[PDB]
Amino acid sequence: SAKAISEQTGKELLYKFICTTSAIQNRFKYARVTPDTDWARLLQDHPWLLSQNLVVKPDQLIKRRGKLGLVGVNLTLDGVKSWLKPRLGQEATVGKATGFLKNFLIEPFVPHSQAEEFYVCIYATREGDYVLFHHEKAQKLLVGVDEKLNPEDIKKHLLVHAPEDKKEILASFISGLFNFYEDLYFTYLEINPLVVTKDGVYVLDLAAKVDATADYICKVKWGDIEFPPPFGREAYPEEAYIADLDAKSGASLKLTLLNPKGRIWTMVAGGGASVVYSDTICDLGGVNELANYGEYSGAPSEQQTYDYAKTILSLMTREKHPDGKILIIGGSIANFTNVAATFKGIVRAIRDYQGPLKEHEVTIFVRRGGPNYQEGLRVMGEVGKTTGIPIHVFGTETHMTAIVGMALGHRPIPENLYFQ
Amino acid sequence: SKSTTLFSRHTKAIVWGMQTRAVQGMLDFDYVCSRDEPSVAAMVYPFTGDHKQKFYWGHKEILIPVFKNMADAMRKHPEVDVLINFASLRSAYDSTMETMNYAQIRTIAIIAEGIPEALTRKLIKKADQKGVTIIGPATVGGIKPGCFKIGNTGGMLDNILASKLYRPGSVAYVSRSGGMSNELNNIISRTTDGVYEGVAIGGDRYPGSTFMDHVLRYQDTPGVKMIVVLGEIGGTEEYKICRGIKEGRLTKPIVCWCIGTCATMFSSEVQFGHAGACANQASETAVAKNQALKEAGVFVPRSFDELGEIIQSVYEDLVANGVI
Numbered sequence A: 001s002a003k004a005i006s007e008q009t010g011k012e013l014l015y016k017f018i019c020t021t022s023a024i025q026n027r028f029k030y031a032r033v034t035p036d037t038d039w040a041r042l043l044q045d046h047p048w049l050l051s052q053n054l055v056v057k058p059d060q061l062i063k064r065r066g067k068l069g070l071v072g073v074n075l076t077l078d079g080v081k082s083w084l085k086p087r088l089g090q091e092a093t094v095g096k097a098t099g100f101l102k103n104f105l106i107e108p109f110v111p112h113s114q115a116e117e118f119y120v121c122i123y124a125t126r127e128g129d130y131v132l133f134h135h136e137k138a139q140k141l142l143v144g145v146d147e148k149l150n151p152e153d154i155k156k157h158l159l160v161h162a163p164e165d166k167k168e169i170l171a172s173f174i175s176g177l178f179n180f181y182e183d184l185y186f187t188y189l190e191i192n193p194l195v196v197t198k199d200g201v202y203v204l205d206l207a208a209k210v211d212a213t214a215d216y217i218c219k220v221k222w223g224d225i226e227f228p229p230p231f232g233r234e235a236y237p238e239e240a241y242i243a244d245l246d247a248k249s250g251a252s253l254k255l256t257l258l259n260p261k262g263r264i265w266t267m268v269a270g271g272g273a274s275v276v277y278s279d280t281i282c283d284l285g286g287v288n289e290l291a292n293y294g295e296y297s298g299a300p301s302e303q304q305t306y307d308y309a310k311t312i313l314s315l316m317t318r319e320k321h322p323d324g325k326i327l328i329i330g331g332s333i334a335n336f337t338n339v340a341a342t343f344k345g346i347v348r349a350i351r352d353y354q355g356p357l358k359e360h361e362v363t364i365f366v367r368r369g370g371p372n373y374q375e376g377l378r379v380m381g382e383v384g385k386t387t388g389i390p391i392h393v394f395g396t397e398t399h400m401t402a403i404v405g406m407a408l409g410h411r412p413i414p415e416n417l418y419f420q
Numbered sequence B: 001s002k003s004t005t006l007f008s009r010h011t012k013a014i015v016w017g018m019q020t021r022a023v024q025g026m027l028d029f030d031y032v033c034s035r036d037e038p039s040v041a042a043m044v045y046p047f048t049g050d051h052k053q054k055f056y057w058g059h060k061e062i063l064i065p066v067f068k069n070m071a072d073a074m075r076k077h078p079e080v081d082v083l084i085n086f087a088s089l090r091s092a093y094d095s096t097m098e099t100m101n102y103a104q105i106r107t108i109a110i111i112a113e114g115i116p117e118a119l120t121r122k123l124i125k126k127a128d129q130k131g132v133t134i135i136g137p138a139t140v141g142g143i144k145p146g147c148f149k150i151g152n153t154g155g156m157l158d159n160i161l162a163s164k165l166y167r168p169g170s171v172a173y174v175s176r177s178g179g180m181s182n183e184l185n186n187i188i189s190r191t192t193d194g195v196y197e198g199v200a201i202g203g204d205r206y207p208g209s210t211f212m213d214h215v216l217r218y219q220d221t222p223g224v225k226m227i228v229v230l231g232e233i234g235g236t237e238e239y240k241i242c243r244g245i246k247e248g249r250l251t252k253p254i255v256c257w258c259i260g261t262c263a264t265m266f267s268s269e270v271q272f273g274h275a276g277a278c279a280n281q282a283s284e285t286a287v288a289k290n291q292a293l294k295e296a297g298v299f300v301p302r303s304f305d306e307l308g309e310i311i312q313s314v315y316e317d318l319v320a321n322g323v324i
């Protein structure tokens, strides 16, 4: 999947790897601030912070930072510190996402006129990459999958309305930008604004996404690239652990925490079914209690499914909920995932966590078909009997999502359908 | 769009990769569909030398040749027009490009998840040039009852029999999801005369063939009388169905449900399991697409829970009017 990167990450890569005749100014002149920053060491490392006025803004995958009032412009370092005092560590809702402002970027202020500001954006579609340019309704050009984008192409198709004295430098920069976009497997790159003064090119702003599946191609250039969570979410070590399992195997293992304290947990097979189960849970009023989104698929082994399930079970036994908790172990009728092997891995995790699961008043609902599903359902029923955990087990004769309404109390549990 | 018909009871395929369980499942299907001959003519696997692999045709042990080099497999099997590529993500691009140097190949299934989008776009460009239909990447494939089964799709004989996948009914479907395609086999077999053809286009942002590519094939296939689409959050593909109805191109009844309605209720953006399942604009949400489809005259259930009910209602109306 395509993943956003911070402005700092994108600029670090751009300054290292772009090829252009244009003289890009202020390369690597940025400084990162967090609630833990020691300002004396920050200044030791970036003495240019004293040398001219500054711009400060979050770098947390928030868009429209200027229109949100979140850019402090033309400030002394003392003015930046004052600007950060009410903001650093503050809660912020942006749109409908709510998080904490904890990562900021400081850069030199660049005096310039509005006529010296430009907009550039590149983004991927099925048919190629569109390049947008606006002096400030933007000019727009499709670059086909096998096409080059040379400076003369940019002048002809995109710079018709650009100041004559800036066409050469703009065309060179944009051509280099496009080659950089391709070589590092970007899918989205926006500079808003690009500034060109008498002294050269300044990148005042950057947002970007890279195709994270290209790590095996790009790792030498990307390095230990960071993909932050979207604004409004945190990153969790359990997510990184599952991601590391996912990276080792053809099997698919995915986990995103939505609400660690929620009482509704899922452990569903398939990218499709996992979404359908999430849809059903939310249709029945459970959005605020849905703890996770994730899935396993592509025939994981018993051991992979064990390591996956133990992560979930640990996560759901961190603190008690007054009404107990629910675990939805669901899926389609699988095409080739071994349901006995995968459910034996889950059962082993359930056994290892039976004490905590009982302490946290967990009820488990199961629906699954596929290869060897009858034995998979049997071992689920048996681990419930031996541990005393309530587990309600259904097969191909139960509608896929029926266990959601059962688990949430909207419909009775049909014992006449167990194991079928 | 490309060929209307991809598979028949005479289809022969080459399988790239050492996937003996998937091949044997295809042969079990071929046998109960009463095909004259196995659907897999040869395998390509560069990590071993040329050899023959044992398989079963009913009770009978048979031999299928495994080639180190694709050129030898193609040369010795000119009857093959399908390749099913189980290459790892690292080499799926090169082996799919290689396959398209063979004019005999008219359809390619690409199984692997994790192929970079920019590489898949190059595969699509070459396939479009040549008129080759790509199913995938990141898919289990698809199934045409009576005729041909891609790889693991539909599983083993117990499921093929249970869902009546050994002979075609009147209902065609397309989904991103492999798992859910086999759920659709089950639902459709219980509510109608059964699946005619199903395709899983895969989870990636740029599927080698789209929902509309296959909906058009089904519109143009006389044996298909109704079409089911399990759509998904992300991208704007399903609006092409609205457009095709408006234009009078799509006249058979279409039932569609787009999964991912939960994303509208979340406070942050969520990437779901399929690489392509992330809404980058309001128009790409499942809620938006479901509404547009309903307004265009698609039969859209209230939720996934009512999909089976609406399929059965459309089917019974078509029986009543003598279409089926």
Ligand SMILES: O=P([O-])(O)O
Pocket (backbone or CB within 6 Å): A062, A063, A064, A065, A066, A192, A193, A205, A206, A207
């Ligand atoms: O703050 P942004 O929208 O220019 O990235």
Ligand SMILES: O=P([O-])(O)O
Pocket (backbone or CB within 6 Å): B057, B058, B059, B060
């Ligand atoms: O038809 P079979 O299974 O006896 O060979």
Ligand SMILES: O=P([O-])(O)O
Pocket (backbone or CB within 6 Å): A269, A270, A271, A272, A273, A297, B176, B177, B178, B179, B180, B203, B273
């Ligand atoms: O495509 P899946 O992950 O739903 O099988």
Ligand code: NA
Pocket (backbone or CB within 6 Å): A245, A246, A247, A248, A249, A250, A251, A252, A253
């Ligand atoms: Na994986």
Ligand code: NA
Pocket (backbone or CB within 6 Å): A252, A270, A271, A296, A297, A298
């Ligand atoms: Na999957």
